[PDB]
Amino acid sequence: TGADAQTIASTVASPIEDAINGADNMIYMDSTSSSSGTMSLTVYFDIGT
Amino acid sequence: DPDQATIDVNNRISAATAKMPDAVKKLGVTVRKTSSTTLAAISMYSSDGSMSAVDVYNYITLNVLDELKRVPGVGDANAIGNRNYSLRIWLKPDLLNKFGITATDVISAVNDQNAQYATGKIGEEPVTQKSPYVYSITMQGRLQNPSEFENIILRTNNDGSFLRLKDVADVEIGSQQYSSQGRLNGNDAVPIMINLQSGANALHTAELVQAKMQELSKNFPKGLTYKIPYDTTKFVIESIKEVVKT
């Protein structure tokens, strides 16, 4: 809370996304970041895991 | 599956650590896989009377109990009572007020004079003046024996002398807690309760327990003996022999 919408995706989502990438049976992921302080990152996996 | 169910509970504790009080977060909610019953119960005592009872608890929390937690299959091996010795500070409200010292003065003085902090190294790298060697810095900030704790000085008097902690309190290595004791046929004995996993082989693991206890028995001091009078698997062994007979 209290951060810009862009600073959340830059300082909170990036060390998370860069660390989750390379996971097993992962297809793609997206993270929405709002000025309300919320960072919602959903990681999608391959069908049948 | 014990593990599929375990890492399914985990994916609900971290999922619901948001609707959580902040004070329980810091100490951490712990999830583990262990049976709700007790597999066995070991008892250790002094066969003569020199080891007493609270001292035997320490021999367990130093040599015995740590090895019992690692034999294959056991889920938990807690010694009841928490009677391992702590460094107890016994304040006296009389002498605390004879010297105008509230208990908070002893709290910060002990918390500050007993802790250990980071120091650093001497002459590492962002240097232009050449350094031949490089040295580490040992610290030694904790206090080992109770005498050093008595000298925790709460107040510095203007006449050079200091108001030490012993002048308002008593220091002794006693016990983390004496809320419980233990008996074995009337003798002062320390109880150790051994748990089983969520789906291990009670016959297998409980036999490895007695085998490990026999290994640690070779290093017992003086008249320190042990007996395991409660074992829910010995009935299984004695009932297996009956079927071979049948």
Add this chain to the structure above:
Amino acid sequence: TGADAQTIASTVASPIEDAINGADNMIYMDSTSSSSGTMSLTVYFDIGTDPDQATIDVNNRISAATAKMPDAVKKLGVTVRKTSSTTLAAISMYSSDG
């Protein structure tokens, strides 16, 4: 960050007293506390163990052993990493003369 290796030896004694876990898993473990500022605690598990199972098991317990840690370490970070994976290839990166 700082600390004589004797002090780091008293911040590894908390995960050491914590990484005593495993239903069908652990054999032994060795920690090396260094004056260089780091401590590497290597836990070996019994052969024939799912490395993902061994990783999630040892990692689940440290989340409860962090309350007794100094603040200079909780601030920096404690990391677990499976090391039974086969090492493929290594790469060296440098700038020649430039």
Add this chain to the structure above:
Amino acid sequence: TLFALILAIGIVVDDAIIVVENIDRILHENEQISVKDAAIQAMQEVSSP
């Protein structure tokens, strides 16, 4: 499982003795036939049961 094995002692020999007994019937009713051929005539009778 150990209860079923003691239970099996009295059923495992059910088929064995139910054929050996029929060999004795043929022998006490046929002085001519030989033992090796009597076992042949036995399995002719007590195989369906």
Add this chain to the structure above:
Amino acid sequence: CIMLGAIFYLYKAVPNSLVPEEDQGLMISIINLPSASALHRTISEVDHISQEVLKTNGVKDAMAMIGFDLFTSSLKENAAAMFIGLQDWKDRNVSADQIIAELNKKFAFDRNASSVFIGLPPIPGLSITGGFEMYVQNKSGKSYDEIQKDVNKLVAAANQRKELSRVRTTLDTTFPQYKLIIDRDKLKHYNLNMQDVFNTMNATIGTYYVNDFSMLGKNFQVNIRAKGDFRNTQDALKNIFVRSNDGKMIPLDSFLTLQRSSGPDDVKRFNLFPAAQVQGQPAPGYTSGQAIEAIAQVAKETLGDDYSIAWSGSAYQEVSSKGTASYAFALGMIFVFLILAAQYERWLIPLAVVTAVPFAVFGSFLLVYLRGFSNDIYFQTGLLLLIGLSAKNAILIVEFAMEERFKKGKGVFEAAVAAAKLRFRPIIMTSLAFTFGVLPMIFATGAGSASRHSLGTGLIGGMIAASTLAIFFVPLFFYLLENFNEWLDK
């Protein structure tokens, strides 16, 4: 039967080994400047050693990790490890055996910085292909300056005689340090708190991490630290101040009088207790298994009533358990005998097929004796293939001998000869199509030649003696056992 005794001596007189080392273009160097030392002086020596290793005609590329000691897995500034890559065997004219014997002789007996050159093992499981890796614990909890004085009783005597020749320990409390001595009377007489004086010391002659800042997306640390020139001195603590409670600034030279001392740089805890790592390897002739049984015996003698002779590394995987290598071969033979007894319809006939196996192990253990090899596991691998092939041909031989004696009606003598006459053509043409097939392994020129030079030298001599020495005796045992079987009719 005399040949059977020749196999007992052939087996007892060959070196019992495990796997053989081979020339895979790879080199490692453990550079160790004297203890403590400095980083820049290690750099001055790393770029000096990485220059003369490129001088050899069989070296291709090199790279080093300055400031990380592999002897301890820690990043000590006085050491470095170097990773060297050799040229391809099509270009290099020498192997790594004499290159190491040249380099570890040129450097390790000269420079002030010790540099031992070794090579990576072929299989990552073993720790030193022949030696051990054991830890010695202490439940009683004693000072490191005394446990150092106890491990010396073990290592110095383990190298005296007995069965080992290079028993090492990695515990060293004789590492230089600066022990700060506190004066609690002064620190509080000066009206100071200890959280303050050590928080300001971590910001001057130590690294202090305050917070992070934004740049290029990533958030990096910021660290307060005195300039290096006012920290490299012996007593740089003389110009660091702390704000007192009263308001005055107080020098740390009053109560923090620094002094030299000795203590371990890397403290290691193995299984909850302080422990020391012991590494080594046996003498030229001693086997690995008994060498692990050597330190165990001598450690029960020169230790105390609180030191657990714990085990780790590969020496623990061998100590863990026993009693399995036999009850698998035994049931294998029982299943072999029954599989054949159901085929030949006789009990005393499958023994003829079994007798044609000692020929394969005699010819296989003979060629590895003349060439001077050791029965590793790549050689015993082909020994399995030869028993499976020798016994295969022997099955068909006794099969046609049973067919000739009982279907065609020929006599035992005339059938034992007519059967070997039938099987002679295929046995030879398989051997010529197989001995010639795995013949390129004898003169193998490339990587992984440790296996093929022992695999080929094993199953080439085995194939010769299992299809020229063996094909004469399979009929004899049929002649002996079948005649004895017809005797039993009486």
Add this chain to the structure above:
Amino acid sequence: FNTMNATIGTYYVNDFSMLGKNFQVNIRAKGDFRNTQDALKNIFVRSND
């Protein structure tokens, strides 16, 4: 709160080491009171004055 928890109850404070393992330092007033109302007479805490 820390005064009552270090006189009537037991206080946590930092730990100490001996013989190997790390044990606790625990603070509690040795002044034992059969009752309780007299305890609050003698336990003090200085204010912001």
Add this chain to the structure above:
Amino acid sequence: VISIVLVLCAVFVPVSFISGFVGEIQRQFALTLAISVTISGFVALTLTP
């Protein structure tokens, strides 16, 4: 030929029952040869003739 497969697998499979560090290497060789003997043995009495 059928007895060859039942007797060559009788010497390849048993050496796969040693759980030692050396035995786990030899399990690779043995079971590979056991697959070869069985598969090439099946091809021997079906595809070859």
Add this chain to the structure above:
Amino acid sequence: FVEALILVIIVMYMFLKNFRATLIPMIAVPVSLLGTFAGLYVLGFSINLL
């Protein structure tokens, strides 16, 4: 593999004399080894040094 396959070609022509006889092992050895790969795959193994 191809060397032992060619040695089979030579041994088959030397001991039987007809090229039609050397063509048959040229189909057994490929299919047998090829099928052995399917065995090593489904059973669980993988292609490695050993």
